[PDB]
Design a protein around this motif. Structure first.
Motif, PDB file in Angstrom:
ATOM      1  N   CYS A  16       0.393  -1.273   0.061  1.00  0.00           N
ATOM      2  CA  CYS A  16      -0.153  -0.451   0.168  1.00  0.00           C
ATOM      3  C   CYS A  16       0.755   1.545   0.430  1.00  0.00           C
ATOM      4  O   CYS A  16       2.121   1.222   1.136  1.00  0.00           O
ATOM      5  CB  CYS A  16      -0.550  -0.127   1.080  1.00  0.00           C
ATOM      6  SG  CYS A  16      -2.685  -0.713   1.322  1.00  0.00           S
ATOM      7  N   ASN A  17       0.405   2.307  -0.670  1.00  0.00           N
ATOM      8  CA  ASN A  17       1.177   3.836  -0.781  1.00  0.00           C
ATOM      9  C   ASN A  17       0.124   4.285  -1.486  1.00  0.00           C
ATOM     10  O   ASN A  17      -0.397   3.867  -2.264  1.00  0.00           O
ATOM     11  CB  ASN A  17       2.636   3.285  -1.503  1.00  0.00           C
ATOM     12  CG  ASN A  17       2.487   2.569  -3.353  1.00  0.00           C
ATOM     13  OD1 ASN A  17       1.533   1.573  -2.785  1.00  0.00           O
ATOM     14  ND2 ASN A  17       2.524   2.985  -4.165  1.00  0.00           N
ATOM     15  N   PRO A  18       1.093   5.719  -0.827  1.00  0.00           N
ATOM     16  CA  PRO A  18      -0.245   7.092  -1.255  1.00  0.00           C
ATOM     17  C   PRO A  18       0.185   6.717  -3.129  1.00  0.00           C
ATOM     18  O   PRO A  18      -0.934   7.761  -3.916  1.00  0.00           O
ATOM     19  CB  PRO A  18       0.300   8.202  -0.761  1.00  0.00           C
ATOM     20  CG  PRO A  18       1.669   7.871  -0.030  1.00  0.00           C
ATOM     21  CD  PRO A  18       1.450   5.903   0.202  1.00  0.00           C
ATOM     22  N   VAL A  19       1.618   7.558  -3.684  1.00  0.00           N
ATOM     23  CA  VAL A  19       1.957   7.777  -4.585  1.00  0.00           C
ATOM     24  C   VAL A  19       1.686   7.053  -5.317  1.00  0.00           C
ATOM     25  O   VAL A  19       1.144   7.766  -6.910  1.00  0.00           O
ATOM     26  CB  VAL A  19       3.743   7.388  -4.222  1.00  0.00           C
ATOM     27  CG1 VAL A  19       4.063   8.134  -5.989  1.00  0.00           C
ATOM     28  CG2 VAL A  19       4.343   8.744  -3.581  1.00  0.00           C
ATOM     29  N   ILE A  62       0.515  20.999   2.023  1.00  0.00           N
ATOM     30  CA  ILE A  62       2.428  20.613   2.029  1.00  0.00           C
ATOM     31  C   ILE A  62       2.623  19.227   2.994  1.00  0.00           C
ATOM     32  O   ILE A  62       2.421  18.523   3.569  1.00  0.00           O
ATOM     33  CB  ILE A  62       3.239  21.732   2.793  1.00  0.00           C
ATOM     34  CG1 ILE A  62       2.574  22.970   1.786  1.00  0.00           C
ATOM     35  CG2 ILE A  62       4.091  21.701   3.505  1.00  0.00           C
ATOM     36  CD1 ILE A  62       2.087  24.047   2.773  1.00  0.00           C
ATOM     37  N   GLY A  63       3.894  18.661   2.094  1.00  0.00           N
ATOM     38  CA  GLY A  63       4.450  17.790   3.235  1.00  0.00           C
ATOM     39  C   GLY A  63       5.663  17.282   3.390  1.00  0.00           C
ATOM     40  O   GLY A  63       6.961  18.497   2.909  1.00  0.00           O
ATOM     41  N   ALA A  77       0.231  11.266   0.322  1.00  0.00           N
ATOM     42  CA  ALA A  77      -1.084  10.645   1.307  1.00  0.00           C
ATOM     43  C   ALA A  77      -2.290  11.475   2.204  1.00  0.00           C
ATOM     44  O   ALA A  77      -3.353  11.942   1.579  1.00  0.00           O
ATOM     45  CB  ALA A  77      -0.155  10.184   2.918  1.00  0.00           C
ATOM     46  N   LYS A  78      -1.058  13.273   2.181  1.00  0.00           N
ATOM     47  CA  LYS A  78      -2.481  14.082   2.820  1.00  0.00           C
ATOM     48  C   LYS A  78      -3.381  13.929   1.765  1.00  0.00           C
ATOM     49  O   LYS A  78      -4.197  14.466   2.209  1.00  0.00           O
ATOM     50  CB  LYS A  78      -1.373  15.288   3.202  1.00  0.00           C
ATOM     51  CG  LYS A  78      -0.853  15.083   4.777  1.00  0.00           C
ATOM     52  CD  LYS A  78      -0.523  15.650   5.248  1.00  0.00           C
ATOM     53  CE  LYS A  78      -0.046  15.384   6.847  1.00  0.00           C
ATOM     54  NZ  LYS A  78       0.408  16.880   7.483  1.00  0.00           N
ATOM     55  N   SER A  84     -10.411  13.706  -1.695  1.00  0.00           N
ATOM     56  CA  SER A  84     -11.365  12.806  -1.074  1.00  0.00           C
ATOM     57  C   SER A  84     -12.760  13.799  -0.480  1.00  0.00           C
ATOM     58  O   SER A  84     -13.340  13.614  -1.561  1.00  0.00           O
ATOM     59  CB  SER A  84     -11.035  11.827  -0.048  1.00  0.00           C
ATOM     60  OG  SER A  84     -11.799  11.409  -0.272  1.00  0.00           O
ATOM     61  N   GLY A  85     -12.073  14.368   0.561  1.00  0.00           N
ATOM     62  CA  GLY A  85     -13.844  15.106   1.135  1.00  0.00           C
ATOM     63  C   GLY A  85     -13.398  15.502   1.886  1.00  0.00           C
ATOM     64  O   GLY A  85     -12.970  16.573   2.504  1.00  0.00           O
TER      65      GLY A  85
END
Length: 89
Positions: A16-19, A62-63, A77-78, A84-85
């Motif tokens: 699992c990964n956001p990128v 920002i990350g 990720a953020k 999304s919402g």
């Protein structure tokens, strides 16, 4: 005109990964790959930290991450939730 079709593809079991997620969502929203750029940079030598921000078509987040590669994810990720919402924070 134009035609749209994805086709039945077996579920590729992968970590699992956001990128890798933001890349799937964007396509669904009709946007282009996210922009990764380092804004700020802080931290000592033993422990360096880069502040990377994700610039989305109509979204921004920002990350930060010890390393550049990591930072990107921290931001992406953020973004997931942001776009999304609900934004828990």
């Amino acid at each position: 005109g134009s035609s749209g079709s994805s086709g039945p593809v077996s579920p590729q079991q992968s970590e699992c990964n956001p990128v890798g997620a933001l890349q799937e969502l964007v396509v669904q929203k009709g946007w282009r790959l996210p922009e990764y750029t380092v804004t700020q940079e802080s931290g000592p030598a033993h422990r360096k930290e880069f502040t990377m921000t994700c610039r989305v078509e109509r979204f921004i987040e920002i990350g930060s991450g010890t390393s550049k590669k990591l930072a990107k994810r921290n931001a992406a990720a953020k973004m997931l939730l942001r776009v999304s919402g609900p934004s828990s924070g």
